[PDB]
Amino acid sequence: IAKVIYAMMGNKFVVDVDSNGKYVWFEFVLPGQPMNQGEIWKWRKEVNPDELHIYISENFSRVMDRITEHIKYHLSQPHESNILNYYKKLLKAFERSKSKIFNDSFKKGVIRQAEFLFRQRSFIQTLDTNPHLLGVGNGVLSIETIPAKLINHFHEHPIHQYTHICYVPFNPENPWTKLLLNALQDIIPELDARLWIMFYLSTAIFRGLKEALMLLWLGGGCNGKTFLMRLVAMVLGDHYASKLNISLLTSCRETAEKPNSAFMRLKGRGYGYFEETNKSEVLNTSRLKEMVNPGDVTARELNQKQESFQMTATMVAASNYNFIIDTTDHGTWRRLRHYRSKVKFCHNPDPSNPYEKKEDPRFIHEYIMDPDCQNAFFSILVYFWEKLQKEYNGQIKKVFCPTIESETEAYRKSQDT
Amino acid sequence: SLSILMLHDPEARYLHKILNLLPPEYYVEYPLWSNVVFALANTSANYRPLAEWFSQKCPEKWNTGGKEKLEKLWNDASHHTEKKITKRSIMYWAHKHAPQQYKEIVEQGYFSILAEYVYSYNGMLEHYMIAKVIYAMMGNKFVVDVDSNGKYVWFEFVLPGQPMNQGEIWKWRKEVNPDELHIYISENFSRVMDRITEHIKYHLSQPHESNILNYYKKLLKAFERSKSKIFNDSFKKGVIRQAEFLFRQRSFIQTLDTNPHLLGVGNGVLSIETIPAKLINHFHEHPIHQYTHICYVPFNPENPWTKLLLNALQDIIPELDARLWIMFYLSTAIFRGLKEALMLLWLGGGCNGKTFLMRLVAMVLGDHYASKLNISLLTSCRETAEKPNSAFMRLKGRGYGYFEETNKSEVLNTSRLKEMVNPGDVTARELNQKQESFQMTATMVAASNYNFIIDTTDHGTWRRLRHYRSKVKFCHNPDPSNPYEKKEDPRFIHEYIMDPDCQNAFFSILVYFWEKLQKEYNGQIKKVFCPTIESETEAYRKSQDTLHRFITERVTVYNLSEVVTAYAEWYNTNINVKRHIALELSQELENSVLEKYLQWSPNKTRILKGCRILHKFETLICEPKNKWWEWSPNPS
DNA sequence: TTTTTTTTTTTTTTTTTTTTTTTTTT
DNA sequence: AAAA
Ligand SMILES: Nc1ncnc2c1ncn2[C@@H]1O[C@H](COP(=O)(O)OP(=O)(O)NP(=O)(O)O)[C@@H](O)[C@H]1O
Ligand SMILES: Nc1ncnc2c1ncn2[C@@H]1O[C@H](COP(=O)(O)OP(=O)(O)NP(=O)(O)O)[C@@H](O)[C@H]1O
Ligand SMILES: [Mg+2]
Ligand SMILES: [Mg+2]
Secondary structure, X not given: OHHHHHHHOOOOEEEEEXXXXXXXXXXXXXXXXXXXXXXXXXXXXXXXXXXXXXXXXXXXXXXXXXXXXXXXXXXXXXXXHXXXXXXXXXXXXXXXXXXXXXXXXXXXXXXXXXXXXXXXOOOOOOXXXXXXXXXXXXXXXXXXXXXXXXXXXXXXXXXXXXXXXXXXXXXXXXXXXXXXXXXXXXXXXOHHHXXXXXXXXXXXXXOOOOOOOEEEEEOOXXXXXXXXXXXXXHHHHHHHEOOOOOHHHHOXXXXXXXXXXXXXXXXXXXXXXXXXXXXXXXXXXXXXXXXOOOOEEEEOOOOOOOEEEEOOOEEEEEEOOOOEOOOOOOOOOOOEEEEEOOXXXXXXXXXXXXXXXXXXXXXXXXXXXXXXXXXXXXXXXXHHHHHHHHHHOOOOOOOOOOOOOOXXXXXXXXXXX | OHHHHHHHOHHHHHHHHHHHHOOOHHHHOHHHXXXXXXXXHHOOOOOHHXXXXXXXXXXXXXXXXXXXXXXHHHHHHHOOOOOOXXXXXXXXXXXXXXXXXOHHHHHHHHHHHHHHHHHHOOOOOOXXXXXXXXXXXXXXXXXXXXXXXXXXXXXXXXXOOOOOOXXXXXXXXXXXXXXXXXXXXXXXXXXHHHHHHHHHHHHHHOOOOHHHHHHHHHHHHHHHHHOOHHHOHHHHHHHHHHHHHHOEOOOOOOOOOOOOOEEEEOOEEEEOOOOOOEEEOOOOOOOOOOOOOOOOOOOOOOOHHHHHHXXXXXXXXXXXXXXXXXXXXXXXXXXXXXXOOOEEEEEOOOOOOOOOHHHHHHHHHHHHXXXXXXXXHOOOOOOOOOOOOOOOOOOOOOOEEEEOOOOOOOEOOOOOOOOOOOOOEEEEOOOOOOOEEEEOOOEEEEEEOOOOEOXXXXXXXXXXXXXXXXXXXXXXXXXXXXXXXXXXXXOOOOOOOOOHHHHHHHHHHHHHHHHHHHHHHOOOHHHOOOOOOOOHHHHHHHOOOHHHHHHHHHOOOOOOHHHHHHHHHHHHHHHOOOOOOOOOHHHHHHHOOOOOOEEEEOOOEEEXXXXXXXXXXXXXXXXXXXXXXXXXXXXX
């Protein structure tokens, strides 16, 4: 029955041996079937194939009915005696075996046998390898060519992870788009700094090897930080972006030990951020350098064998005070960027000061959970990435910003006692 | 063209039959008719003719109205990935309006299913041919989903009149292994087998040919052996394992308890979606699992416990504005969504309200929604790298946490402060689990006897803080002429907390106050006015801010290096004999009151003037009638 | 400072059955 | 006695 089943649906299930050595089942979802939210046209991991069990017991049964009626038909026609005896014996034996497909143990055995037929070697390690494909709420998004194209039909791209944010083409006339643009312009007035900081955040959707560069900007308080940073993470989803822990920077070098789960984040991610400090901390000038170099790094999860992975994710960190850096080598201090906020939100925005605006205690407690604003923000990000790619050929350093590489080099003129 | 769908889909006919059962009296009015239309629209998108068939009844409303508004509602429900109402409500309504006459339909139906199987397979019953029948019988009381670990889990909807714990009616409960399903298979399902047996006997009695009688005899003999396998343990386990697939409802665990406007109470489920709060104590469909064991009653001041609690609470803190503010802040604990990044921190001499009100709220909200935490989450540094921390894995979904212990005066940290009060996110690990990031939303308070040590001046640490101190004292010797002293009652603690009735009264008080705040200040806790607070707090801010004390106590140009040395020695002389490596002093120096004395020396040093370095001694509201809880007037 | 111990694998996975099953029925 |  395993051969027959593989004939029936060999195009909707794939089996491969995971890291731990136990077989796992993947299946391709199609519209109009019971399913989670926003994972259409994508492979979903399945601990135990229940759809296969119900298919075996229901749809495969119809074929057995065809066999039974064929047996009855050939029994109807007149023939010899011995042939009729043979057909009667065959029919009775088959009837005894007709109900075995409903038994639980038999189905488990059938599934275990089918695990060998369905196997497709080299499927896990080829999954989500292409950095030009993004899993979105209403399909999979392609950024191979400009303009970006949305795939919402059949394909063969092995896409597993996704974000639950539906994608629409960038329309500035949408009320959410205009509101986000206005609030964003209010966050930072300078045009050049705004364009540069948006270009830096646009590359987060990419997942291949990027330019070695770090972003680090502090604020006095009640500033736009932790609003747009958390907004980007919410848009990207935990699959592609997640928060980190400052202990990966402020603490000492991670001792040999054995496992490391906190560092096991940012493996396959494209974006991470820190927004907690106290007084000021040192960054060790190391244990971050390999977190920004476009190379690989090695660590291991809980009760799992040692492994190494590439370092491909845009980084950013916020605080309230300045950071402590003690070095002058050209190798470091070259892949760092610093910004300082110039605005402040409060309930009493005293006039005559442009660096002061009325606070709206609604951008945080809501306006993040609303899906439509997230869709608009995703449109903004994809538009900006397209612009950067078609203008500067994907080089964040080639863009020019007078405010940056002036304040940052002024910081370089400090910290050099 | 409902007839074709009737032909194609039996369930369609069955559902239409259910419509046939219940009276159209509730179909007449728009609300319930729209409800049933939405419900059937949730089940696929091709059942439109069935409701359309249901629409011609009373066609006066249907045409010119109902007809077009039906398709309007269908289109609306088409694009509303929102709260779902399904056929279960229709079945419950049919059971309500027309009991004891609808059931015969359902027994006929699954008797037909079982008979179809037994005829198709000559009485050889296996697994999954009883799973279908069981799912047909009880498909509205069990749901199966897969949790993170990969294990299948069973949930069941409880109903009144069945064995259960205290106060978990109308809510789902997790079960490791479904008992009720096993007893149901063994006992209730057996009755259908009797129907099959008697049907076989009946058709055996009727006169027929020889061959057909032989066939019926063989069928009966075969079925008899299979009739007794439903009592076998291994067979029941196989049936359960097979039925696990049919019962599965994808995206159930991840949508469980997600709505922050629903609370599980001892006598049902409470909804604070609208004002006033509505108590649901009947059938519903919201996925509520966790609960508190406190029954809810509408807020009534006439209850003796309510009056006693109000009087005692007023006795705890005299000031009207402070009382209203601190009650408004505590009322937000019932909410579980994003809140204002605010924290309360109040201390007293002893035998006061500290470590008392927090406990009462703690018991009222139950361990599911509120819990006590450990102060080491504040007065200690972060754990090294990725050492698992199960203490932090409290407050995951909790709405309230409190602190009650300190050792003299110690630091508070700010990293943890800016981590556990923000409406942002947080990540951590507990033990033998992978890293996890969970949204955190909980009002927090801390009780102590001594002040906390704060070393910072920015908004990022001072915006989120509030401070209060007690003004009474409970003891057995109530010295007269001192209103800040009351005869203690050693009975509010050793009892009056374990009593359920006072807990119910306090919960009523809390929900009433939350409703008041929501309808008055639109949910903005910062918008409310309190003169005692935001003055005592800023007075605390006028302490713990040694820079201004140094400026007013000890303050040519002398450059800049003298300032940090002067600050350090002043610290040693007045605060602590230790340095503070305050190289940064320059920026908050100019942020302090030093701009007028600020100088810019030609030797590329921006410095200070007027450096008269003093070394030793060389020098140069209303009150209510009887109801304070009545919210007072609009200014209040 | 103590860095390692605590956590970790685990750890049950063969029994369940299956088959037979003689007896019964042919 | 072989089959169910
Ligand atoms: N309004 C009240 N009227 C009378 N007695 C009260 C009142 N409130 C509390 N009490 C009593 O006063 C005591 C309260 O103790 P408690 O509040 O725990 O002290 P505390 O504030 O925590 N200081 P400490 O316990 O030393 O940390 C109990 O005996 C209560 O019964
Ligand atoms: N145009 C605007 N854009 C963004 N935020 C705004 C705007 N106008 C007002 N705000 C306020 O900015 C807040 C978001 O900033 P918020 O994260 O609260 O500051 P913060 O810097 O993170 N606090 P902290 O981390 O301690 O410095 C919102 O809650 C609003 O009250
Ligand atoms: Mg902010
Ligand atoms: Mg107390």
